[PDB]
């Protein structure tokens, strides 16, 4: 209903959190975000 | 293929461009400059056409050799340190591209061909514009992400400036979520001075003016003629940082000092808050007003939307921030007004409801609460605080002390010799409110002094002493009944005068 | 050939041919107007040119 | 649109030319807009920030602020 914009999106883009945070990892090691993201 | 050596950073201070490193490609730019003069003389001899291919394909081989490899490597390393690092060092980096470009202008003058002195020169400047175009002005990378890292350094070095004043001296509601959310629609710290913030002490405004006017100058002179838009963008980000984060955060610092608003018998946390808001006025309002005025006079180029930065950005922060501070000087005026009014009239039933019609003519809680409330209120800071609001602090806070004289001194409800205790305690406050730091009370509390000699209407001193000059601060039919403000009115037939 | 200056900042502006006629001025940016037919005419009359 | 806000343009531009027919032959050719308070180098802008530091001691800075 609303998590599809919010959190079912996040349940459809779960790995895309760290994958989208990797977008700053070529432009301008990876433990404390990609292992223990809470 | 450098690996981003120290240091990296040592450059994020509240100043101009700073420490390491060179460039080290200005090494390579000088090497391409004397290599440029070398192949300039050589190919000047050994060719037929001149710009072809020296300016044509060997300037192309210059930037294709250097500015492709070494300068995008320099963007990779300088950006690989940080953003505002490579924003300021992008201003310095491309400023060095203008340096060596100007060395190709004088080195262009070492050449002597007119179509080469035409846009074949500006082909080298156009490949300089291509090195510009890899981090092009057409995107929000070169300006809006420069404004974003400028917001990183702006909120960083400016929001966390006045550190314990911005965060925190309150919750912070601090009458900005309380009074301005009600009227325009109390102990919070104790007790010294305007001590970073206000403002802080104009040095944070010199810090935010230093770095923010610094990078504002950097993207100003650096970027193209599309400048007044971003000048209104980052200048409105100074309307964030100064007209909102220092008129309503670092002067919500000062309104956490005006979180001692409504300070009735609470004039100790407004004994250090007169100088705090008074120096928000002085440093923040004077320094930010004249500095934003004359600095804005340079900043406006020729536009009439620049007047929308004059009126709606700047002058509506003088009218809007005038609605911020003077309404918090209206409720701070209610803090000192409720202070002297409530606290100075808070004497008990032997002074402020005295029936002592033939005795008790001395000093009491009118003098102790008038000199304590007011002379601990405004003769702590506000006597030496605002000269930035000189006739307003002194003449208007003392004019409300005259209003407080109408609440404490001309409203001291004592009888026919207790009125003489107002003529030694509220006339003992009339000169004392005129020394209490809110000190305009030498004429209207002196009107309460002659009314105090009128409020002592006994059966031998009721008619003409009440009929004196400023003893018409007692009532028109309540001259003889000047102690009708008391328990007993005027001792057996108060009202034999109006007929 | 007066390569003009941005008068406020003191930086350079674009270049301009200075065409001082008998009684009118043509401070014309001929860039990239390589003519000298319809170049950028910062123009006025000389009788009130200051 | 350049009638629908063409005429909304011009009927505005006359309307203020109504309100600046003030009783002087008002002649309406200044353009200054002052708030409540009345280079040619790289670091001269920093000298303008420090000129505001010269304004930071100027004058008091005194004004009126009451309500």
From Swiss-Prot, chain A:
Organism of origin is Saccharomyces cerevisiae (strain ATCC 204508 / S288c) (Baker's yeast)
Q: What else is known?
A: Present with 377 molecules/cell in log phase SD medium.
The organism's taxonomy opens as: Eukaryota, Fungi, Dikarya, Ascomycota, Saccharomycotina
The family line of this record is:
Belongs to the SEC3 family.
Point out the gene that encodes the protein: SEC3
UniProt protein name? Exocyst complex component SEC3
Q: What does this protein do?
A: Component of the exocyst complex involved in the docking of exocytic vesicles with fusion sites on the plasma membrane.
Highest taxon of the source? Answer: Eukaryota
* Oligomeric and partner information: The exocyst complex is composed of SEC3, SEC5, SEC6, SEC8, SEC10, SEC15, EXO70 and EXO84.
Swiss-Prot record, chain B:
Q: Does the keyword Protein transport apply?
A: yes
Biological processes per GO annotation? exocytosis; Golgi to plasma membrane transport; protein transport; vesicle docking involved in exocytosis
Q: Could you share any additional remarks the record makes about this protein?
A: Present with 2340 molecules/cell in log phase SD medium.
Share what the entry says about its subunit structure, partners included.
Answer: The exocyst complex is composed of SEC3, SEC5, SEC6, SEC8, SEC10, SEC15, EXO70 and EXO84.
Q: Keywords of this protein's UniProt record, alphabetized?
A: Coiled coil, Exocytosis, Phosphoprotein, Protein transport, Transport
In the UniProt record, does the keyword Lyase occur?
Answer: no
What's the protein here called? Exocyst complex component SEC10
- Please tell me one Gene Ontology term that the record gives under cellular component: mating projection tip
Q: Which family, according to UniProt?
A: Belongs to the SEC10 family.
Functional description taken from the UniProt entry: Component of the exocyst complex involved in the docking of exocytic vesicles with fusion sites on the plasma membrane.
Swiss-Prot record, chain C:
Compartments in which it is found: Cytoplasmic vesicle, Secretory vesicle; Bud; Bud neck
Q: What does this protein do?
A: Involved in the secretory pathway as part of the exocyst complex which tethers secretory vesicles to the sites of exocytosis. Plays a role in both the assembly of the exocyst and the polarization of this complex to specific sites of the plasma membrane for exocytosis and to the budding site. Also involved in assembly of the spliceosome.
Recorded family membership? Belongs to the EXO84 family.
Q: How does it assemble?
A: Component of the exocyst complex composed of SEC3, SEC5, SEC6, SEC8, SEC10, SEC15, EXO70 and EXO84. Also interacts with SNP1.
- This protein is called Exocyst complex component EXO84
Q: Which residues of the full protein are shown?
A: 353 to 402 of 753
UniProtKB/Swiss-Prot annotation, chain D:
Where, per UniProt, does this protein localize? Cytoplasm; Cell membrane
Source superkingdom: Eukaryota
Q: Where are the transmembrane segments?
A: none
Question: Tell me, how does this one assemble?
Answer: The exocyst complex is composed of SEC3, SEC5, SEC6, SEC8, SEC10, SEC15, EXO70 and EXO84.
Q: What does this protein do?
A: Component of the exocyst complex involved in the docking of exocytic vesicles with fusion sites on the plasma membrane.
What protein family does this chain belong to?
Belongs to the SEC8 family.
Q: From the Swiss-Prot or TrEMBL record, give the protein name.
A: Exocyst complex component SEC8
* Species assigned in the record: Saccharomyces cerevisiae (strain ATCC 204508 / S288c)
User: Top-down, what is the taxonomic lineage of the species of origin?
Assistant: Eukaryota, Fungi, Dikarya, Ascomycota, Saccharomycotina
The gene that this protein is the product of is SEC8
């Amino acid at each position: 209903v609303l998590c599809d914009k919010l959190w079912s999106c996040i349940q459809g883009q779960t790995v895309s959190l760290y994958l989208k945070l990797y977008t700053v990892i070529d432009k301008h090691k990876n433990d404390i975000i990609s292992a223990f993201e809470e | 293929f450098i690996k981003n050596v120290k240091f990296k950073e040592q450059l994020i201070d509240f100043e101009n461009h700073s420490v390491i490193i060179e460039t080290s490609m200005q090494n390579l730019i000088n090497d391409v400059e004397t290599v440029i003069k070398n192949e300039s003389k050589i190919v000047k001899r050994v060719f037929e056409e001149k710009a072809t291919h020296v300016i044509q394909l060997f300037i192309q081989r210059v930037f294709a050799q250097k500015i492709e490899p070494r300068f995008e490597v320099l963007l990779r390393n300088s950006l690989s340190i940080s953003n505002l690092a490579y924003v300021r060092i992008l201003h310095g980096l491309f400023t060095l591209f203008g340096k060596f470009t100007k060395s190709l202008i004088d080195y262009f003058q070492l050449l002597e061909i007119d179509d080469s002195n035409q846009i074949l020169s500006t082909t080298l400047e156009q490949c300089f514009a291509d090195l510009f175009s890899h981090y092009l002005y057409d995107r929000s990378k070169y300006f809006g992400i420069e404004k974003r890292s400028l917001e990183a350094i702006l909120v960083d070095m400016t929001s966390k400036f006045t550190v314990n004043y911005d965060k925190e001296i309150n919750k912070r509601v601090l009458l900005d979520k309380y009074k301005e959310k009600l009227s325009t629609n109390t102990a919070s710290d104790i007790d010294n001075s305007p001590n970073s913030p206000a403002n802080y002490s104009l040095n944070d405004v010199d810090s935010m003016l230093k770095c923010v006017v610094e990078s504002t100058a950097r993207v100003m002179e650096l970027i193209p003629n599309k400048a007044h838009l971003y000048i209104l963008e980052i200048l409105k980000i100074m309307f964030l940082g100064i007209v909102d984060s220092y008129m309503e955060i670092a002067l919500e610092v000062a309104y956490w000092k005006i979180c001692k608003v409504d300070i009735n018998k609470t004039a100790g946390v407004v004994n250090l808050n007169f100088l705090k808001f008074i120096s928000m006025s002085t440093e923040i309002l004077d320094l930010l007003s004249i500095s934003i005025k004359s600095i804005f006079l340079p900043l406006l180029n020729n536009s009439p939307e620049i007047k929308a930065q004059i009126i709606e950005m700047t002058n509506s922060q003088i009218q809007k921030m005038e609605i911020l501070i003077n309404i918090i000087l209206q409720e701070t005026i209610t803090v000192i007004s409720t202070k002297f009014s409530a606290i100075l009239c808070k004497q008990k039933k032997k002074d402020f409801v005295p029936k002592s019609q033939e005795l008790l003519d001395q000093d009491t809680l009118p003098a102790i609460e008038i000199v304590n409330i007011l002379n601990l209120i405004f003769e702590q800071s506000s006597k030496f605080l605002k000269g930035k609001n000189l006739q307003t602090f002194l003449t208007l806070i003392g004019e409300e002390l005259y209003g407080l004289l109408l609440s404490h001194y001309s409203h001291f409800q004592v009888n026919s010799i207790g009125g003489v205790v107002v003529t030694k305690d509220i006339i003992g406050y009339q000169t004392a409110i005129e020394d209490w730091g809110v000190a305009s009370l030498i004429d209207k509390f002196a009107t309460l002094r002659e009314l105090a000699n009128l409020f002592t209407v006994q059966p031998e001193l009721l008619e003409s002493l009440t009929k004196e000059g400023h003893l018409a601060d007692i009532g028109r039919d309540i001259i003889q009944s000047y102690i009708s403000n008391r328990e007993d009115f005027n001792h057996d037939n108060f009202i034999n005068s109006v007929k | 050939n007066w390569m003009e200056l941005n008068t406020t900042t003191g930086k350079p502006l674009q270049m301009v041919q200075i065409f001082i006629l008998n009684d009118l001025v043509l401070i014309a940016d001929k860039s990239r107007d390589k003519q000298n037919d319809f170049i950028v005419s910062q123009c006025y009359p000389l009788k009130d040119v200051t | 649109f350049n009638k629908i806000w063409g005429k909304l343009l011009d009927e505005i531009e006359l309307l203020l030319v109504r309100y600046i027919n003030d009783p002087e032959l008002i002649s309406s050719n200044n353009g200054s807009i002052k708030p409540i308070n009345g280079e040619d180098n790289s670091s001269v802008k920093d000298q303008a920030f420090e000129l505001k530091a010269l304004l930071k001691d100027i004058f008091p800075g005194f004004s009126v602020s009451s309500n």
